[PDB]
Amino acid sequence: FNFDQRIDRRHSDSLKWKKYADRDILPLWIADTDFRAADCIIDALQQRVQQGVFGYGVTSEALAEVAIERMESRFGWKIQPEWLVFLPGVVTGINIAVRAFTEAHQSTVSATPIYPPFFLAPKLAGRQHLSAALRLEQQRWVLDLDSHEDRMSGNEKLLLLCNPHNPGGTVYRRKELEAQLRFAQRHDLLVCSDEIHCDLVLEPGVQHIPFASLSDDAAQRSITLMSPSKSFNIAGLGASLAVIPNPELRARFNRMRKGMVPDVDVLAYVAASAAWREGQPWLDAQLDYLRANRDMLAQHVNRLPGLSMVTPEASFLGWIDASGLGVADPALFFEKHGLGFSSGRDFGNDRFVRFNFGCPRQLLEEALQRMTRALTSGY
């Protein structure tokens, strides 16, 4: 059956295994797993390639159908079909939202640290950005936007959220989402919720909650970004979708997208459909494997005498506080000890490193031993 302990060689076109191509450094940085795609995804792609023709394609009605069924059955959120807008990636959906829902004098609000494109998009669009620092509470990274009221200027317009949160891995609860909703209403902000990791919730008894499912007011003021790219390791194809219930906001979004952003690949539609249509047993087995990998990394990091890490509620990263080392560059430090992490400076906190434990357990054990060898003793 499913065997996530398989080790592949790349020796491919993967950006992950080519940054440290000819160096003895373990790639554990970019947010993709080393897992072979589900059989349903590969078999669907083969049936489409053997079809022969690759002309201009239409948007997948099958993907829109399986996406609606998934949002209603797994998250309790009924989706109207015309709310969907398919995109070639999630990063492009973040940029279009900023260019379309903000003007030159208006600003954006998000958390810090966060997925780098969240404050890179206002930077490229000529928009100033307001950042609210995440604070640790009960071994969880929580967001307190209400404690940043007086730091605002009235120019704020677009609220950029991330649930589950990259890189912290926090799965926001219902009370915390309703607090972020009340913050958006009190300041009359538009919300852009990035929910790419919604399928990777590991905590039992806790369900991912879409922001636009809280009420009809949240739905009419927000845009929801979702994709099976990270759930099924098909980011190299990049089939995603945006859910905009507001008709006027959808027209402003599509007008900003038209011509500048192309349509989704013909083969990317086939993989994204098979991922959400029949890949669920594969995704179930990956969660158990990732939780076992997560628990090992979490217990190992807390024993080392210079690192702190919150157990991520959502796989598969990986936020390690390396401020206890005292080095001027924690990411460059681990690189000279054969460990290639994502530098936290790109996320807005040069004291952290992002750990990608989305890999076979044999490779994780070798990474954990290089961490033990690096800190002890001594360096």
Ligand X SMILES: *Cc1c(COP(=O)(O)O)cnc(C)c1O
Annotated binding-site residues read: 56, 90-91, 115, 197
Q: How far apart are CA 16 and CA 236, in angstroms?
A: 11
In the complex with a copy of itself, which residue's Cβ is closer, 133 or 256?
A: 256
Binding piece for a copy of itself, criterion CB under 8 A, among 52-60, 210-218, 303-311, 325-333: 52-60
In the complex with ligand X, which residue's Cβ is closer, 156 or 194?
A: 194
Among 65, 178, 265, 329, binds a copy of itself (CB under 8 A): 265
166 binds, among ligand X, a copy of itself, none (CB under 5 to 8 A by kind): ligand X
Please report whether residue 324 would count as binding a copy of itself according to CB under 8 A: no
3-state SS assignment for residue 185: helix
- Taking residue 111's Cβ as centre, other Cβ atoms within 10 Å add up to 25
CB of 268 to ligand X, least distance (A): 10
227 binds, among a copy of itself, ligand X, none (CB under 5 to 8 A by kind): ligand X
Beta strands 352-354 and 319-321 are antiparallel
Closest Cα partner for 273 from 50, 148, 86, 117? 86
In the complex with ligand X, which residue's Cβ is closer, 241 or 304?
A: 241
3-state SS assignment for residue 136: strand
Q: How far apart are CA 5 and CA 7, in angstroms?
A: 6
- Positions in the binding site for ligand X (CB under 6 A): 31, 89-91, 115, 162, 166, 194, 196, 227, 229-230, 235, 238, 240
Q: How far apart are CA 254 and CA 240, in angstroms?
A: 15
DSSP type of residue 150:
T
Instruction: Give a three-class secondary structure readout of 330-373.
Output: HHHHHHCCCEEEEEHHHHCCCCEEECCCCCCHHHHHHHHHHHHH
Please report whether residue 233 would count as binding a copy of itself according to CB under 8 A: yes
In the complex with a copy of itself, which residue's Cβ is closer, 238 or 245?
A: 238
Site residues for a copy of itself per CB under 8 A: 8, 10, 12-16, 18, 30, 32-37, 41-42, 45-46, 49-58, 60, 88-89, 91-92, 94-96, 99, 117, 120-121, 124, 233-238, 255, 258-263, 265-269, 271
